């Protein structure tokens, strides 16, 4: 069984490179962040442009939704993160503390906390309600490329250009694990929906499925191009069990999680596919491309 992802909608509006696309947990919306300093909201099923959210002084590298789908958090080159009330478009808080580009961000499941990663080499844990930085983790010795909470928010996984993936205890801020045959820059990391595995991408055209407890590599996925960009990868769980990733050859790659075989390549983009997202309940992939393309694509499969 292979998926049958076909193009349904192309979403144009950003005037500079799109950096990140994320589906709201309620499945109604898609949020996009761009180098044009804007956040855009789009209908998840019809690609219908909804609204623009502005405020950042420089471009945005990442965006994430709260669990109730009411708030967004964005990570900007302006060295801040901003918390937004989606319906009103208001900026609730400006998160200050990072001394360089804020690259990545995520809410925890309870959505009372925000995790962020920066070029300043740190991981920061923020209180949503107050906007205060609760902890600064001396995480890495190079830019932090990704940050993600596990299923119950008790763990944080971070990745960096230093070649490491680190597992952190949310409550204490203590480093619980360091994942090390070589150390190529780690451009992306995230926990599996069950929280037992971590999917990590490295700038050597390789994606790896790790078992965090045992520190063992279970699966390796290749065939795509990834040597310069921090491309988002995902676990597609609505139909068949796939690994979805963007690629520097302008394609969306889909692998069978178990066999590691490429099951689909999506053609359509005209620049690096920097970001992909999988809909929480429907077999829908959102993809986003860089400066020379500027569009977002919505693809759907029967399985």
């Amino acid at each position: 069984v292979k998926p049958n992802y076909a193009l349904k909608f192309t979403l144009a509006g950003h005037t500079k490179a799109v950096s990140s696309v994320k589906f709201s947990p309620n499945g109604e919306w898609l949020a996009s962040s761009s180098a044009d300093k804007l956040i855009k909201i789009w209908g998840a099923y019809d690609g219908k442009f909804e609204k623009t959210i502005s405020g950042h002084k420089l471009g945005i590298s990442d965006v994430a939704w709260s669990s109730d789908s009411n708030l967004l958090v964005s990570a900007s080159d302006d060295k801040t993160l901003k918390i937004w009330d989606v319906s009103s478009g208001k900026c609730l808080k400006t998160l200050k503390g990072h001394s360089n580009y804020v690259f990545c961000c995520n809410f925890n499941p309870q959505s009372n906390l925000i995790v962020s990663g920066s070029f300043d080499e740190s991981v920061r844990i923020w209180d949503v309600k107050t906007g205060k930085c609760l902890k600064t983790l001396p995480a890495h010795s190079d830019p932090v490329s990704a940050v993600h909470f596990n299923r119950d928010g008790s763990l944080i996984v971070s990745s960096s250009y230093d070649g490491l993936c680190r597992i952190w205890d949310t409550a204490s801020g203590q480093c619980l694990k360091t994942l090390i045959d070589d150390n190529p820059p780690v451009s992306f990391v995230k926990f599996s929906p069950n929280g037992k595995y971590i999917l990590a991408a490295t700038l050597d055209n390789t994606l790896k499925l790790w078992d965090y407890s045992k520190g063992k590599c279970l699966k390796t996925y290749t065939g795509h191009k990834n040597e310069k960009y921090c491309i988002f990868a995902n676990f597609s769980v609505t139909g068949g069990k796939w690994i979805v990733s963007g690629s520097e050859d302008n394609l969306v790659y889909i692998w069978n999680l178990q066999t590691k075989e490429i099951v689909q390549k999506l053609q359509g983009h005209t620049d690096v596919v920097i970001s992909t997202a999988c809909h929480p309940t429907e077999n829908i992939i959102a993809s986003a491309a860089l400066e020379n393309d500027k569009t977002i694509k919505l693809w759907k499969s029967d399985c």
């Binding site: 500079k16 490179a17 950096s19 990140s20 962040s33 761009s34 180098a35 044009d36 300093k37 420089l58 471009g59 945005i60 590298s61 990442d62 900007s76 080159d77 580009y101 690259f103 070029f119 830019p143 250009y161 820059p185 451009s187 700038l203 040597e227 310069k228 960009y229 921090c230 920097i274 860089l290 400066e291």
Partner: peptide, 9 residues
Amino acid sequence: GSARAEPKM
């Protein structure tokens, strides 16, 4: 304008 949109040189 955005760090993620720039390649690792």
